[model samples]
Target chain A: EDEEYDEEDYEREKELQQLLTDLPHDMLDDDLS
Target chain B: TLRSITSPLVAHRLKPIRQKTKKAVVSILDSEEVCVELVKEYASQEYVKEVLQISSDGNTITIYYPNGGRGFPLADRPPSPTDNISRYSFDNLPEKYWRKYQYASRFVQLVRSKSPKITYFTRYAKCILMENSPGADFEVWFYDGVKIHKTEDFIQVIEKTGKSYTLKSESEVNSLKEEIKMYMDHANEGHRICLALESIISEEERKTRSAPFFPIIIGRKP
Candidate 1:
């Protein structure tokens, strides 16, 4: 219930996975800056 | 004349916390040879400390006790921290007289604010919020006995009740307001009379003190 879900194809999913791994971890997604 | 007319009209109307006060006064103060001593015998000890007067005009006798002091207090004497408690509450009224009731309630509020000091039982506030209204689970709005309530509370209650527009039909509000009309009217008039006595008595006292020489017809004509 605390988790989010989104649908994707394998290619889309792979792209998302790549984006997740390559994205700056310290970007502060819930940013105050 | 003012004292006799005004005092009892207010007194008999006053709803004493203790019942049987008028009976006690009538029984003790009117009996043959009855006086302050008899008031002591019959009047409730909770009150009856200040014996003021007892007189008669052969046909009808009069007994006097200080308001907030002698008679069963309309509210608790000395104004308890929570002296403003409701003696009664209502949930409905005759539908026909609702608007008239609202006007009378406003009238009482006008008089009450004007004469706060002399009003007998107007403190702990006869808070009037018709229960099960739109607003629930909120801080109650105090209306100084007859004032408006929180609009926020009404909105909350309306929302909670899941109304398209309103929970209580205007008709319901109107009827309930009318139900409270007589109570507000009574409270208002009683307060005005109470203030009048305060002014009338105090003014007479002041006039008495200012000039000590007002009555003499000694002359050579005599």
Candidate 2:
């Protein structure tokens, strides 16, 4: 299927994971009332 | 240390921020009947100093203070009894008087419909927030004119990601706008982070799909 894993998809997923990791812990918990 | 990537992100996300407006401006509906009823009810209030009924091509009613100062300036008067009431702007009214107008406006709205939706102007971001059912305790977030989903998964994201801040008063709610502004900032990678989080938080079937239930997690402090 077209949904099969691809190099590009893998790269993007890694990038997003790294971005989330780089984010400050407090930034994730910022209170946006 | 990844200073280049992290520093700007934090700086842009946590910069000095302020609200766009102090309080949401309360505007009256265009129903002549409702206007007349509102004027009658407001005039009867003990705090009301005086009620001025102006007769013109369209009619106008202006309420005044005990010291003869103008409060809210409204348009159109009641046809019956030859008497009555925005040009109705709440910007100039004092805090106490402004609240009186809000109460009156909300009362009229509630009487007209059982579940009246009130749209509030955003304080920090350039969007409108709405309360589908006023008198309720929660506010729904609107981004780019779209309503964000209030699913449990979205709520969990908000809870695990940040400390919970209980909203007790109107001013406290207004202060939270700064956080919304930061989260909504597209120029500072906030939108990307939101999108990524959305993908992670949504169900597998809903991932990468454009649907109401799969909407990005904005803010939900209930």
Candidate 3:
């Protein structure tokens, strides 16, 4: 039922979390901007 | 082998509760009674749970430890004044319908004031803040004789997980603070208070030395 959240529901929740965007560690420079 | 020939040996002993212990404190409201942080203090070094057990309903309180344990009721009902004197302890709780609750403060000060022949352990009663407030407030309690009296209506309290009870209320407690003020005036029974005090001191004693003598071992084995 739509009221229930099971296996596929968990995978979608995981995909949503990974969509967040942030600066990559390798792209950072030590000098001031 | 009583030396060379047969001999007679006799001995006398004094087993006065080699150590006297008690617990009382102030300032701890149940998280449910007020907030969520207080959950950290289910049972901390400062506060000791008592016979008064808070019902999940958050309204009813009852003597919780009587199931073959030291608590409010001895058997089917609260101990009557006629209960045995040596092994039983029950106080004249005020004529209130609500079950009485007990909370303890830190014990270091208690031991310093009581100064037992040997302190077993001592620690400050501490719990997480239950209400929006920042710190868990607590106070010094002096239950002179451990007698019973009316339970004060406003004591900050909480309940334990998997247990059926709540701590007394502490948030902006009501004018009912009069109950605990009176409990200290009376509070005469219950040995767990004594045992807890001993446990605190015992733990302290053991920490100071690699191995400290337990209270029960007071009399030398002969």
Candidate 4:
């Protein structure tokens, strides 16, 4: 039951942000437009 | 009427993906492997619930929570190895157990945009960090709504994000270090040696492994 969270709340979670910071955002450009 | 006839008919072709017309989502996935962020993504849409699963072959796992509308069925399970969830036009995904899991990837809109020609593609890829210590380093990709920043500005964005990565045990890594020396010395014999191995390593190794080797090559022409 607690597994779900409000989107705004998800944005607030530092844990989640840390995870994003840890992620590799360094891939080459994706230019579909 | 003659004036009307003089005016040639005009028809504007549409982009292959009419994404701007309706809210859309695109990512790469198939039956075997999937990557999803669950509750943390798609926040404004309302919380439907989270769906997590281990694929039939146990190679992939997909976790996602869909909201905004009732559980909607994605397209037909187009054979295995199809890859790229974006390839399939899933207006929404409701059904579960689509297929096995192999690749881990994720993407989110962050916020929908006003322009239809472009959209924010917050992309990621499934990856494992292999070093003295081994563990999963998850990653993924996708787009929705619009895009800002010049083509060049977006290219800059990509550069800013692409950062870094590793698996291995302490003793094993140490052994390789010393062994590399031995191999280097042995290469002096006018022969070469190549060794490679794959192991599932994790944080449980305690200190993360350093010098995750993709192979430190040493050679000399005789």
Best by DockQ: 4
* Candidates 1 and 2 compared by TM-score, better number: 2
Model 3, span B1-222: residue lDDT tens: 211221111101111111112222112122211000011122323222233323222233333222322223212222322222222112322233111121111111121112122211113221111111111112222212121111223232221122222224544334344754343222212223444544576578767955434323121111
Native contacts conserved, per model: 0.00, 0.00, 0.00, 0.00
Evaluation by lDDT, superior candidate among 1 and 4:
1
Better of 2 and 4 by TM-score: 2
Instruction: Give candidate 1 regions above 4 Å deviation.
Output: A1-33, B1-116, B119-176, B210-222
- Cα displacement (Å) at residue B72, model 4: 5.8
Task: Give the C-alpha lDDT of model 1.
Answer: 0.27
lDDT of 2 by residue, B1-222 (tens): 222221110010011111111121122333322221222124533122233222121222344332324433333332223223223322333232332333333323322221112222343222211122222212223333222222212221122234444434446435655655343342124323433443465456465555334212243212
Please report, as a residue range, the 10-residue window in candidate 1 chain B with the lowest summed lDDT: B7-16
Query: Quick one: ranking by lDDT, best first?
Result: 2, 1, 3, 4
lDDT of 3 by residue, A1-33 (tens): 113443323533343233211112221112322
DockQ of each: 0.00, 0.02, 0.01, 0.06
Question: What TM-score does each of the candidates earn?
Answer: 0.18, 0.19, 0.15, 0.15
What order do candidates take by TM-score, descending? Answer: 2, 1, 3, 4
Cα displacement (Å) at residue B190, model 3: 11
TM-score for the first chain of model 4? Answer: 0.37
Output the chain A TM-score of model 1. Answer: 0.46
Worst 10 residues of 4 chain B by lDDT: B12-21
Question: Best candidate, lDDT-wise?
Answer: 2
